[PDB]
């Protein structure tokens, strides 16, 4: 048990936006109606809540020390124990990446036991939408098998606590594992197992009939492609195939049916072209009702095919091939932004085992649900209430206008007039990945933002409702940068540190740019003073040096303070942060080096001894009129990692979260000038989460 020190009870909720990232799997529990789980590649897992019609994040106890476990390569249930759920966790398998873990729960994901593995888990690498790689033996639940992408097949006999390599399985890159539950009776190890591996020479699909002791290549399987996913029904093994593990680059594929008892193969592909197949679901109560989804059929768009006669005929559900006309109806009322995307990366699709007319499928930006597959045409709902997977690279909270503005990976800039409803206009700036956003303190209608295609930046004069792109950008710019722009308090001057170019300044809203003088390093995250439009700040985490401009960004000088340094790969922990309403009041985070505070425009700084480590800091409305703004800190205080608030200028802190609300990897944190106690947190793959004191 961790020590439960003094804290204020807070309520944490996602800013409602909807989806935004790659959901990599959905699992209906076959023996409890209403029990459904979903896995993602960078945002943990979810459990459906029918009572509140929303998804519940079940991995927010992951923290900065094990945030890689937010990558869910596989999720598995136990058909004979509805309270159990397992997860195969990890993001990358490269040499610089750590090992993965198996997480086991006996309370439907409310709490987890973490079992670290000796192998790396690629929950955010190629083929992450294949699966499921983790399986519970459907007849003897103490047995689990785990397919990995770099270390072959592993078996557990103690419900995932310990894992042993199955040395008899030679291939090392596994796509999925699937049990044939009819091959044994309850209480005995299931004898028939199929494993699909990444191999396009005709040796992707393997079969065992002795519980995994011996293995053999399935004769007659297709060549030039790999087995992607499988379903078993009525003695048939239905397998989707593609010439790439996905989610991209599939230019060939098929759907085949394998008769388990005699080894016969029948091609039941609905159509063939320069694309593959992956998603497949056989109706758990009707083996002749099957759905399959194309993969990387980019033009006109991906297709979902439905059969009710076991693949003899297929009906296209999404669009009509005869004239490429869309026929399915898509309801994005819950998240109007999502209409800028078309369903793609449909690597998983599942029919409800308790209603054959209900199904769901995943995309690269959220979950879609159909409640009547028998309708002609079908209607699909963007069903992602509570499911937030966006990466907020930067967020700002102006004191007037919108409550929040977000610069999101992949999806663009958002303007949030309400925290409990997705923005009615959708995306505010449709530019894809946006890495920076700032507003002018004294004129918060003036907002600037950066992105990753030329001219890499844009500005707004009406609080982000309308935008226009920069007429020019600094020479050599290859990207907008990360938290790399600052606009003066009066809105007349912009300092920009883009990728591939030296830090520059503009006096004409981006119509022309001039390189900043003084020798300040490039690629820093620049900060504007909230009062004095001639003062800008730029912190160098590697040298531990603060740079200050007193001439509106024309030139910078290096302050004498020797801050604790940080390695280049940890430079995200170094930042300088100016306080609204207080000229020259800046706070500097140095990661494990602590938190420093300057009240003379950076001329000198003092260590905040109450803070052990500081990763990001924000400021909000003071508790009483005339008091110092409330300080919101993500870091370590007295050995406790979490989120803290100080109401006395940084001398004492109150923890405003608990160990179940750490959210994995927090990118930054902001307060709110209009509401005391309100705290905005940007978390990797978990969108923006805001916290308020819980009413007593
Ligand atoms: O790592 C940071 C870096 O990442 C870059 O993207 C790379 C990575 O993408 C991860 C995200 O991918 C998302 O899916 C997209 C696919 O990656 C992409 O291949 C595919 O491309 C299509 C295109 O949509 C089709 O119109 C065209 O006919 O064929 C192409 C393929 O040949 O599109 C997928 C969706 O893309 C859209 O959402 C994400 C945005 O970032 C894109 O700007 C956007 O692309 C637009 O799509 C619309 C239609 O809605 C229009 O077609 C526009 O013309 C397109 O610009 C996936 O949804 C996410 O979940 C995932 O996180 O990794 C894969 C690699 O191929 C990518 O290059 C990114 O470009 C950089 O800005 C950085 O952020």
From TrEMBL:
This is Type 3a cellulose-binding domain protein. The chain holds residues 35 to 726 of 1299 of the full protein. The keyword Signal applies. GO terms for biological process: polysaccharide catabolic process; xyloglucan metabolic process. One of its GO terms (molecular function) is cellulose binding. Belongs to the glycosyl hydrolase 74 family. It comes from Caldicellulosiruptor acetigenus 6A. The keyword Signal applies. Keywords: Carbohydrate metabolism, Glycosidase, Hydrolase, Polysaccharide degradation, Signal.
């Amino acid at each position: 048990s961790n020590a439960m020190a003094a804290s204020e009870p807070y309520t944490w909720k996602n800013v409602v936006i909807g989806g935004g990232g790659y959901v990599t799997g959905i699992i209906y529990h076959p023996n409890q109606s209403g029990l459904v789980y979903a896995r993602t590649d960078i945002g943990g897992a979810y459990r459906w809540d029918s009572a509140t019609s929303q998804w519940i994040p079940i991995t927010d106890m992951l923290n900065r020390n094990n945030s890689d476990y937010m990558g869910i390569l596989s999720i598995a249930i136990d058909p004979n124990d509805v309270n159990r759920v397992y997860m195969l966790c990890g993001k990358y398998t490269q040499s610089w990446a750590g090992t993965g873990a198996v997480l086991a729960s006996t309370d439907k994901g409310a709490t987890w036991t973490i079992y670290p593995l000796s192998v790396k888990i690629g929950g955010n690498e190629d083929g992450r939408g294949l699966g499921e790689r983790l399986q519970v033996d459907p007849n003897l639940g103490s047995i689990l098998f785990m397919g990995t992408t770099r270390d072959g097949l592993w078996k557990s006999t103690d419900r995932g606590a310990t894992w042993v390599r199955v040395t008899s399985f030679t291939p090392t890159n596994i796509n999925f594992v699937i049990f044939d539950k009819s091959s044994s009776s309850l209480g005995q190890a299931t004898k028939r197992i199929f494993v699909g591996v990444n191999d396009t020479s005709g040796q992707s699909l393997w079969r065992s009939d002795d519980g995994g002791n011996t293995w053999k290549v399935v004769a007659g399987q297709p060549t030039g492609v790999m087995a992607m996913k499988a379903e078993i029904a009525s003695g048939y093994l239905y397998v989707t195939f593609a010439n790439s593990p996905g989610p991209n680059n599939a230019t060939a594929g098929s759907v085949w049916r394998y008769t388990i008892s005699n080894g016969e193969w029948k091609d039941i592909s609905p159509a063939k072209g320069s694309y593959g197949y992956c998603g497949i679901s056989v109706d758990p109560r009707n083996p002749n009702h099957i759905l399959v989804a194309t993969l990387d059929l980019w033009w006109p768009r991906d297709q979902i095919w439905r059969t009710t006669d076991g693949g003899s005929t297929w009906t296209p559900l999404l669009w009509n091939p005869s004239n490429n006309a869309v026929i399915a109806k898509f309801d994005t009322s819950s998240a109007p932004w999502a209409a800028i995307r078309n369903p793609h990366w449909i690597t998983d699709i599942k029919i409800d085992p308790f209603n054959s007319n209900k199904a769901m499928f995943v995309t690269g930006y959220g979950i879609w649900a159909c409640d009547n597959l028998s309708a002609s045409p079908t209607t699909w709902y963007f069903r992602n209430k509570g499911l937030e997977e966006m990466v907020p690279i930067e967020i700002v909270s102006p004191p007037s206008g919108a409550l929040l503005l977000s610069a999101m990976g992949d999806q663009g800039v958002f303007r949030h007039d309400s925290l409990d409803a997705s923005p009615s206009m959708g995306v505010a700036l449709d530019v894809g990945t946006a890495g920076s956003i700032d507003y002018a303190e004294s004129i918060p209608s003036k907002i600037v933002a950066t992105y990753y295609s030329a001219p890499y930046g844009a500005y707004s004069t009406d609080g982000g409702k309308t935008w226009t792109k920069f007429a020019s950008y600094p020479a050599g710019t290859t990207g907008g940068g990360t938290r790399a722009i600052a606009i003066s308090a009066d809105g007349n001057r912009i300092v920009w540190a883009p990728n591939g170019a030296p830090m520059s300044y503009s006096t004409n809203n981006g119509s022309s740019w001039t390189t900043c003088g003084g020798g300040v390093p490039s690629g820093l995250s620049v900060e504007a003073d909230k009062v004095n439009s001639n003062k800008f700040y730029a912190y160098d985490p590697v040298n531990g040096k603060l740079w200050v401009s007193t001439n509106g960004g024309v030139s910078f000088t290096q302050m004498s303070t020797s801050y604790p340094t940080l390695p280049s790969w940890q430079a995200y922990n170094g930042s300088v942060n100016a306080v609204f309403g207080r000229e020259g009041d800046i706070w500097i985070t140095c990661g494990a080096g602590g938190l420093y505070h300057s009240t003379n425009s950076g001329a000198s700084a003092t260590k905040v001894n109450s803070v052990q480590e500081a990763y990001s800091i924000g400021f909000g409305k003071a508790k009483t009129s005339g008091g110092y703004p409330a300080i919101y800190l993500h870091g370590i205080v007295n050995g406790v990692l979490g989120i803290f608030r100080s109401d006395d200028g940084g001398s004492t802190w109150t923890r405003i979260n608990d160990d179940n609300h750490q959210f994995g990897w927090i990118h930054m944190i902001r307060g709110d000038q209009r509401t005391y106690g309100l705290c905005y947190v940007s978390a990797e793959g978990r969108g923006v989460i805001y916290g308020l004191p819980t009413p007593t």
